Design an enzyme around this catalytic site. Structure first.
Site, PDB file in Angstrom:
ATOM      1  N   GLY A 292      20.822 -21.580  10.979  1.00 29.26           N
ATOM      2  CA  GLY A 292      19.431 -21.960  11.114  1.00 29.26           C
ATOM      3  C   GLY A 292      18.876 -21.729  12.500  1.00 29.26           C
ATOM      4  O   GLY A 292      17.674 -21.462  12.644  1.00 29.26           O
TER       5      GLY A 292
ATOM      6  N   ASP B  89      19.687  -6.533  18.084  1.00 27.52           N
ATOM      7  CA  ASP B  89      19.220  -7.647  17.264  1.00 27.52           C
ATOM      8  C   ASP B  89      17.994  -8.282  17.914  1.00 27.52           C
ATOM      9  O   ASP B  89      18.021  -9.421  18.382  1.00 27.52           O
ATOM     10  CB  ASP B  89      20.328  -8.673  17.102  1.00 27.52           C
ATOM     11  CG  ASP B  89      20.059  -9.625  15.986  1.00 27.52           C
ATOM     12  OD1 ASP B  89      19.006  -9.457  15.321  1.00 27.52           O
ATOM     13  OD2 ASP B  89      20.915 -10.516  15.768  1.00 27.52           O
TER      14      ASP B  89
ATOM     15  N   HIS C 279      17.752  -9.535  12.498  1.00 27.45           N
ATOM     16  CA  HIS C 279      18.515  -9.936  11.324  1.00 27.45           C
ATOM     17  C   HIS C 279      17.749 -10.937  10.476  1.00 27.45           C
ATOM     18  O   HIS C 279      17.916 -10.965   9.251  1.00 27.45           O
ATOM     19  CB  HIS C 279      19.887 -10.484  11.731  1.00 27.45           C
ATOM     20  CG  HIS C 279      19.862 -11.839  12.359  1.00 27.45           C
ATOM     21  ND1 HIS C 279      20.152 -12.042  13.689  1.00 27.45           N
ATOM     22  CD2 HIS C 279      19.629 -13.062  11.834  1.00 27.45           C
ATOM     23  CE1 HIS C 279      20.061 -13.330  13.966  1.00 27.45           C
ATOM     24  NE2 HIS C 279      19.746 -13.972  12.856  1.00 27.45           N
TER      25      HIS C 279
ATOM     26  N   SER D 186      19.656 -19.143  14.448  1.00 28.85           N
ATOM     27  CA  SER D 186      19.561 -17.738  14.832  1.00 28.85           C
ATOM     28  C   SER D 186      18.100 -17.361  15.032  1.00 28.85           C
ATOM     29  O   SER D 186      17.203 -17.890  14.369  1.00 28.85           O
ATOM     30  CB  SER D 186      20.207 -16.807  13.785  1.00 28.85           C
ATOM     31  OG  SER D 186      19.834 -17.148  12.460  1.00 28.85           O
ATOM     32  N   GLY D 187      17.870 -16.429  15.958  1.00 30.18           N
ATOM     33  CA  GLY D 187      16.541 -16.041  16.363  1.00 30.18           C
ATOM     34  C   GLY D 187      15.921 -16.950  17.398  1.00 30.18           C
ATOM     35  O   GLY D 187      15.011 -16.519  18.121  1.00 30.18           O
TER      36      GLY D 187
END
Ligand SMILES: [N+]
Ligand SMILES: [N+]
Ligand SMILES: [N+]
Lengths: 8, 10, 238
Positions: free
Chosen positions: C186, C93, C44, C188-189
């Site tokens: 912020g 994801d 994403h 995410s990942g």
């Protein structure tokens, strides 16, 4: 070192 | 915000 | 990170900050060093990223304010998205960044270990979500890399808390029943890392959740063990 190896 | 499920993204 | 506390230099040597240079330079996503040229992050993160020319991977960073216009960074040679990804809430994801240059390892930047596919039988009891994201809905990017400890919850209970969405086996949920500690904008990942037998494993990738730290709404992370084979196919290419 580690169990799941990633090639360089 | 558009999607409450993407508040921790962008 | 909501309800989290500051980390110290060298605590999360695999956490990296993924920046974009357009229209402005900005922190975009967390990510994890998984090998000397490979960053594991969320697919994403790259909605609206049309070329890897505009990505900067920053490793060994404790403070966002460390980054200035002469700071070294790793260029992104290639973006590998899982071919079945469409939305965070729909699974898959996951994404790999193949960097243009090799990464040196030191106390500040070190790879994290993938789970062993024979160790899904493991119930992790020491798990942490980390990132520079908000501690608060409608906040700003935090300067110092934040950490928060959160308990994994069963897929059964995560499903009960998330009617309307299918929580697949390739997802993993974590959070306190009462809320208060979670990833947020912020983060995410970034990784969900878990210490087991003195060895850190990259157990999940922050990917979605209803709001942030809302009670009885745990966070959803890509369940990394379920893609190890996939990772290897991309990282052992011949
Ligand atoms: N939004
Ligand atoms: N410091
Ligand atoms: N499933």
């Amino acid at each position: 070192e580690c169990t799941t190896k990633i090639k360089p | 915000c558009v999607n409450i499920m993407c508040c921790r993204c962008p």
